[PDB]
Paper text:
Since we failed to obtain crystals from the purified wild-type protein, we assumed that the heterogeneity introduced by the oxidation of thiol groups had impeded crystallization. Thus, our results suggested that the observed charge heterogeneity in the purified BtDPP III was not caused by the oxidation of a single thiol group, but rather the outcome of oxidative modification of several thiol groups. Therefore, we prepared an additional variant with all five cysteine residues replaced by serine (Cys-null variant). As shown in Fig 1B (lane 11) this variant showed significantly improved homogeneity with one dominant protein form (position 11). Further crystallization screens were prepared using microseeding, and crystals of the Se-Met-labelled Cys-null protein were obtained in four new conditions: JCSG+ C10, E2, G11, and Midas G7. The best diffracting crystal was used for the complete data collection, and the crystal structure was solved using SAD at 1.9 Å resolution. The structure was solved at 2.4 Å resolution using molecular replacement, with the structure of the Cys-null variant as a search model. Both proteins crystallized in space group P3121, with one molecule in the asymmetric unit. By superimposing the wild-type on the Cys-null structures, we confirmed that the replacement of cysteine residues or the incorporation of Se-Met did not change the protein structure (backbone RMSD 0.15 Å). In the crystal structure of the Cys-null variant (open form), one Tris molecule, contained in the storage buffer, was bound to the zinc ion.
DPP III (EC 3.4.14.4; earlier names: dipeptidyl arylamidase III, dipeptidyl aminopeptidase III) is a cytosolic zinc-metallopeptidase of the M49 family. This exopeptidase catalyses the hydrolysis of the penultimate peptide bond of its oligopeptide substrates with unsubstituted N-termini, thereby sequentially removing N-terminal dipeptides. Despite a low sequence identity (17–21%), the overall structure of BtDPP III is very similar to the previously reported crystal structures of human and yeast DPP III and consists of two domains separated by a wide cleft. The catalytic zinc ion is positioned in the lower part of the upper structural domain, coordinated by His448, His453, and Glu476.
Residue numbers in the entry: 24 to 226, 231 to 675
Amino acid sequence: FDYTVEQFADLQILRYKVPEFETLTLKQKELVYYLTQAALEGRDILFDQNGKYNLRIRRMLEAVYTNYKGDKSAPDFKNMEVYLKRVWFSNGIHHHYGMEKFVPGFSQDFLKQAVLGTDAQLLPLSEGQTAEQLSDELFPVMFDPAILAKRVNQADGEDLVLTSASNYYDGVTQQEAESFYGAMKDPKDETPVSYGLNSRLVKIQEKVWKVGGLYTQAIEKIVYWLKKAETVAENDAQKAVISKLIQFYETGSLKDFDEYAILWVKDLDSRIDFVNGFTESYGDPLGVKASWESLVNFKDLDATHRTEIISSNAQWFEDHSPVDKSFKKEKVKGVSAKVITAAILAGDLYPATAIGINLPNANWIRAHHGSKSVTIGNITDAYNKAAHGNGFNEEFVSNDEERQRIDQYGDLTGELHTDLHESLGHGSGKLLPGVDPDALKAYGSTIEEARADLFGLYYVADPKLVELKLVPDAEAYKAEYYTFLMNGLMTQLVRIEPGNNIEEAHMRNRQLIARWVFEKGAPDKVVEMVKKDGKTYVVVNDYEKVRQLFGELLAEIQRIKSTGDFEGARTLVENYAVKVDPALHAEVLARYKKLNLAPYKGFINPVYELVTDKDGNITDVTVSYNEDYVEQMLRYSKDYSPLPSVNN
Ligand code: NA
Ligand SMILES: [Zn+2]
């Protein structure tokens, strides 16, 4: 199985497996199939939400690209291909992370001639429009750096509604938009609708995304496949979820959306689950309108059971903690996050995706009905598997014994450390009476993540995990110990710009732990940093002493948090967690850049096929992985692209 697909620009395309899909019942596979069809129909929505020109630009380049009769080896065509591949990845013409508009690496004269050489019937022309007129419209949008420069602008002194290229507002100023929703809100409402979540605000009124409204060509298709899924629901709770979601798309009512989210949160038992709707509001500079996304999934039973083994032993880990007894909870309950297996990704989860989903967003629904927080095990596993043999550990790990141990156990003990951090680490320990939870002020997040990390590091090495059948042998933890220390002392510097220091809380907490252990172990050479041929390597000489030092730092940090010791917190962060050595930074960056590893990853989907008999009865559902990036993007643009090119 090849987890890697291709690499271009600053992007690497991966694939993921869908483990145990074939173990589902046929009726379950059929439900997954329909839900995945409902997911794939939404792609055009996101393109249009990200920019009123995006579908025209995508479709124009697609028509040029697939019908090009010229020299495909020439630099202009190769650069146009890279640009189109970035547009597919980013669901528009802006960087999916940085928000800045792409710079075409090809000439306007080249594109003009390629466009004129394409059959006009294949171009996204409005009725009566010519190819020259389409070019006059779109070329400034693509080529002029001053036009629509940022998809989301967060700069002062500017009308962000007018200086953001996303397409949630049209012909309306920022103050008009902020005031529209400031006035709509009702502060007396204990169960408020999510005002403005599902509409374009235009001139002042809302154009709601719904059947018979804006984007209806795609929403009608989503609803069609959801109605199919409704007929094969696993149980009545899940069926009620699907039925209400259909109603939300048919009416556009935000009260229906709240009703759906309540039913969704109550559907906790079903093997299969999904998201399909206007969900997260990061694409709006005002944080009101939500981009469309979908995910279809089923519970990873083995992985969930493993996290439940950790959760059910919360009290054992608490009792045996190295922290002072006065900081220990007498009764602690562990909460396990379920692990899900993603069957397909779409919209703002595709191709750049998440490793966890925590929904719904409405705080009152979360407070009074609950929530679903899950991690996506097969996406995490694909990230991990794709990295094996990529040259990174070959370049940076001190010796072949470590490289082999990490290759064998690194993925397992890494995920176990995460499970310990997330399911028990933050929940462990208590403050003393009268201590302010905010006593550590700006250092609180760094110290709190260090605390959870140390809890996980201290216990991933415990023989208890062998007894509990979570690790296959007592040596495995050394893989996680080595990579944690290598990352925290040295190799995370690849994320720091030249001349800068450590700023982000997790990066700080990792350097804090590693540098502290390094300092305290130095008289015994517990950890060394050694140079060979001018390259630095982290060398770990006594893993047992590292465990004891992790435990000692855990006790000190627990003390700092539970007593509100701001000066102690500040001393640890400022002395260990911030300063970057310039020589080490440059050395690590030069070694890393030679590896040609792309900084951003995204995934292509598998392909599902419905097998039916003569009379249309389903006889099987198969999943296949033999499609690459170009193929899948073109197939989606051909078969799952129901929106008109202009959505006004
Ligand atoms: Na050694
Ligand atoms: Zn955390």
